Amino acid sequence: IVKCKPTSAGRRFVVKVVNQELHKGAPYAPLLEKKSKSGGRNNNGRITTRHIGGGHKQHYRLVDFRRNKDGIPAIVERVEYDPNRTAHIALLKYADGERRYIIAPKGVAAGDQLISGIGAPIKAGNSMPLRNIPVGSTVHGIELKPGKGAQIARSAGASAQLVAREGAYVTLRLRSGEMRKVLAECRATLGEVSNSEHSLRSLGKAGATRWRGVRPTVRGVAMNPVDHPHGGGEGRTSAGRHPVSPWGLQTKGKKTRSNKRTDNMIVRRRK
Amino acid sequence: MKRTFQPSTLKRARVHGFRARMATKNGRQVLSRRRAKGRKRLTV
RNA sequence: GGCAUGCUUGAGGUUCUAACUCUGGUCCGUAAUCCGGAUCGAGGACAGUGUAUGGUGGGCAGUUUGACUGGGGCGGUCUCC
RNA sequence: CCUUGUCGGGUAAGUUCCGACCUGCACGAAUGGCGUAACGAUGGCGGCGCUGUCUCCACCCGAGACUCAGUGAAAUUGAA
RNA sequence: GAAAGACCAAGGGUUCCUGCGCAACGUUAAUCGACGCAGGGUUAGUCGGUUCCUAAGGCGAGGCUGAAAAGCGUAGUCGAUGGGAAACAGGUUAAUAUUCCUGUACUUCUGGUUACUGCGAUGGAGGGACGGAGAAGGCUAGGCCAGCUUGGCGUUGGUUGUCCAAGUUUAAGGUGGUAGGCUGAAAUCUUAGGUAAAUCCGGGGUUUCAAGGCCGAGAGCUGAUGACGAGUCGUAGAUGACGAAGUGGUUGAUGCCAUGCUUCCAAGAAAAGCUUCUAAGCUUCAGGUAACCAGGAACCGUACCCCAAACCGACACAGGUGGUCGGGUAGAGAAUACCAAGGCGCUUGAGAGAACUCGGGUGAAGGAACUAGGCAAAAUGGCACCGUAACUUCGGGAGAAGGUGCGCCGGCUAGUGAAAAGCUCUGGCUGGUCGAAGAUACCAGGCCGCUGCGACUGUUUAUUAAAAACACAGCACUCUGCAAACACGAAAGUGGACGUAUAGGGUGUGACGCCUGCCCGGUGCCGGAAGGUUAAUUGAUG
């Protein structure tokens, strides 16, 4: 993590994250495919999600989440950059070829973990079911329906903690603060996700956000009464309604969960 | 300067052509209405 | 008074699977995993959906906001002795 | 608001400008409060160079205006 | 003369060329015409299309959803601005040529023949197949110089000359495998993978050897003994024949090697032809392998305009319109000044030389006194060296300010290549000299001191407002545990996102530095249930 010298008006506050562990140039080619840019537009053609557009060409990488190979020792080749994600991914190699990308744990550059219904059991990077692990451990990549794949604790530097165990349900405390009960045969992976040098970065200039795929936002007090309920005014007005979405939704604190189907699996709400 | 009509034959046929009007349901009513007035052309 | 147990019935609590549910897994139609059908896995009389009813609702719509007046706005005045 | 408030600076002379007083009709802290190098086809003042901007205009060169041949409009109009 | 010249794409639709005309048109007259009447005129295996394959996107059998219309979408088949075989030189025309003609080439397909032989998929592998910036180079087109042929002898003063003018051309393809780049190679057994299989790829074991091998401009040789050639000779006006020199030295690109190379984050298209593997089939005729003569390559577009009087603007309208080519002398330069090729004189002219209007030139003595305001004009402007302030986020401010030098003619010293020779050029500091004036013309910074507001580059009211407005990096608050909050949809479903709280929506403030005080009564949200009132639904009793 380096600082930049103020040579220009853009370079004054750029904070980079450089890494020399990353493999310089190539992706492995059969694990790579085409991805198109949406613009934030559904099949009616209209903008649903605002402030998206532009950017750069990207290839989607088929990152493996199931880890269904069992009893095979896998050996890491190298750690690569992945553009549609905040973590680093690793290239694996099993005992008989069959290379494959996974989310990289804290271990890097040819360790050899073992992916099984239980084996070699404890490292960073061993996948094994959630009943055969000690309490108080830190895991990541947690399935919720068995066979479906990792859904929770998957972004950069993220993890969860085991707390309790009884019956079919193995309770864990999420990164947010919510404590879920999770069914016990869903697999998970010991350790933490690789790139934690990511909350320490600053873009510096206005055109740095724009070549990543985020389009300018405009405030609601600088519009007309026809466009946004904060509306127009004379001079700078305090927008004399209570603060509200452009569709009429209260925004400074209003509980909006209404699922009413998964409420049994939650122990404690996030506070 | 730039006037509001820049011509092309590929854009004209795919929007206002016959196989474009005949494809939808409104356009087949545009064909019968413009035919029964008695015009010489039907496909501008 | 209650005694017992019954007969029915409300309200609450727990559990079970067979209804419904699965934007789960693998077979089949199929050279497709959209859609079905078969089987296991999860939830389970909840969710969800009809119909009757409470609440919130400028998100949206149809509309109303008088006259006299030494210009009309402000003020004063509109009936009876 | 009263107001060209009062005091100092700059000009021969300054309702604007700069520095202060504070007696804030009616400043004030994320409708942010006070500072701030570099950047403005940004607002306001002052200075050197420079000049037909100006005292006050004089003269020269082209294209029209004027005369001759060809073609030949427009708005307007109760009647003179 | 970086177009007012040539050429492709659109678009137009006979405006192209020749006879005959001049009423209408053309801002005037017309014998002239992009104008009337009558004929003429576009030649393809290779150039563009069609045929093969796909991107965004469209339509979509079956299928779900919907009062009806219809909506969405799987198999599938359409859609280039991209990806897939092959040709250039010279002659000819009133008007067409990479199309006809001569000359030398290249690619693909079919029918026989012959010598044989494991053939086979739409399915596996391999390949095709790619980002920005930067710098080393290596060539080449081109341009000059010097030779060499044909012709000339003058501007009056000089000029058989160490002079003057012109010309010194040549392709694709062959052979060749260099500058340079990438790359370990070979044998041999074996194998939880390549949704079946595989002798193919992937992984593993041993062994031998230094590496193969794959790409690749361009030079030379050949194509070419030929064509072309100033001219010459035979209404010789038009033509027929002949035709000399055809070479060396330098300087070269923004053009090819380069789809390379190094580096940086924002991590950089698909699919087919092409090569190989096998399944079913296999009858191993068929099918494949080379070799060989034999023949074929269908159909559409080819004229003319194309920074324009032929297209978009009602016009023969100072406007608008994507891409290639682009010589000479000075100059860093595709800027600017004069010119070559090539093209044009802008479809009303002639006078005379009033006021006043427009576009310009010089000015006595003053030098903002003008005015809402130095608006406008004037001035400044190059390269080299010297020199440079407060202030600061330590980069900057800053080419701050401000100053000197510069022309011609002489003395020194009028890269290329044998692992060595001329020409570009491998210096700078000394003299003379002519002018009011040496960046002598076009070309091209006005500078400094205080202060308001916004950190900056940026964006905005097409056609009276470019800002102090909107954006912004940064900061905080809050909602969202995945079939997510949220949005568009009667619904099916799609975005969010093939993402998972270091994430995703919403609201305010707006880099940086020092900081952000008290009030929970009002209104809103969140938390709590004890008690009060309170909806249909039941229906005692009178």
Side-chain angles (χ1 to χ4, degrees):
Chain A
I1 173 169
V2 294
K3 197 62 66 71
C4 187
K5 289 188 184 297
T7 306
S8 300
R11 303 291 292 169
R12 186 176 290 276
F13 295 109
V14 173
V15 180
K16 289 185 179 180
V17 177
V18 291
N19 282 319
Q20 279 70 242
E21 73 269 11
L22 270 66
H23 187 269
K24 298 297 288 187
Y28 183 71
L31 294 171
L32 196 70
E33 64 182 2
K34 187 175 76 67
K35 185 166 75 70
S36 177
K37 298 171 67 68
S38 291
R41 297 176 197 266
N42 52 3
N43 58 4
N44 290 326
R46 294 182 179 178
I47 287 174
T48 66
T49 305
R50 302 182 299 175
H51 316 114
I52 302 172
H56 204 279
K57 285 285 289 296
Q58 296 169 2
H59 282 163
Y60 179 73
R61 283 167 184 80
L62 301 179
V63 175
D64 182 77
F65 282 151
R66 293 172 67 91
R67 294 169 68 83
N68 48 1
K69 298 292 290 295
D70 291 330
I72 310 298
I75 298 167
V76 178
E77 282 96 349
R78 75 266 187 104
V79 175
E80 296 181 355
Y81 180 80
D82 183 52
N84 48 8
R85 194 176 300 276
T86 59
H88 293 290
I89 65 174
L91 181 61
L92 288 179
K93 181 174 67 175
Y94 291 96
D96 51 354
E98 208 268 326
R99 300 174 179 86
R100 186 174 288 180
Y101 290 115
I102 59 163
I103 301 298
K106 198 64 71 72
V108 160
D112 49 355
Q113 71 270 14
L114 190 275
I115 311 168
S116 290
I118 48 90
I122 46 172
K123 286 298 179 288
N126 286 326
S127 172
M128 53 195 285
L130 273 169
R131 62 182 182 272
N132 302 324
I133 51 175
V135 298
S137 291
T138 66
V139 298
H140 69 278
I142 301 101
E143 298 181 357
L144 293 175
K145 287 186 282 188
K148 192 175 183 185
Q151 291 187 357
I152 307 298
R154 208 173 76 184
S155 68
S159 63
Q161 294 175 357
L162 277 310
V163 282
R165 183 174 62 243
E166 55 90 23
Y169 287 154
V170 183
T171 302
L172 42 78
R173 181 168 65 242
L174 297 168
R175 186 70 173 171
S176 172
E178 174 172 351
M179 297 183 71
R180 282 180 64 87
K181 294 168 71 175
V182 177
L183 185 55
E185 283 83 7
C186 296
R187 297 170 68 94
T189 304
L190 302 170
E192 293 84 1
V193 188
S194 67
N195 196 0
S196 68
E197 301 289 327
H198 183 269
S199 64
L200 295 176
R201 195 190 67 186
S202 292
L203 300 177
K205 69 188 187 183
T209 304
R210 191 76 187 275
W211 56 58
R212 187 171 287 108
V214 178
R215 187 168 165 85
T217 171
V218 49
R219 305 182 310 272
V221 301
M223 297 180 184
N224 294 118
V226 67
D227 293 336
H228 195 280
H230 283 89
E234 287 303 328
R236 311 248 183 52
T237 16
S238 64
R241 298 187 72 183
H242 290 88
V244 71
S245 177
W247 299 282
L249 272 295
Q250 182 76 36
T251 190
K252 293 291 185 181
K254 188 176 186 294
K255 303 298 180 74
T256 325
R257 180 175 178 82
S258 294
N259 197 0
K260 206 171 71 179
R261 193 185 72 251
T262 63
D263 289 333
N264 51 359
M265 304 307 169
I266 300 169
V267 179
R268 181 177 295 173
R269 192 263 183 194
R270 176 256 306 167
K271 287 179 177 66
Chain B
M1 60 285 201
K2 193 178 185 66
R3 294 300 174 200
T4 60
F5 170 65
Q6 306 299 322
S8 175
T9 310
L10 190 69
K11 300 171 79 76
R12 192 180 184 95
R14 291 184 189 173
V15 176
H16 305 98
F18 180 76
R19 293 189 50 80
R21 295 286 172 84
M22 195 66 197
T24 172
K25 187 71 180 295
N26 304 116
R28 282 185 279 168
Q29 186 266 326
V30 170
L31 293 178
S32 72
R33 180 173 63 187
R34 188 174 178 85
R35 168 182 288 118
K37 193 182 186 186
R39 287 185 178 266
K40 183 170 68 69
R41 260 71 62 85
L42 280 77
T43 56
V44 187

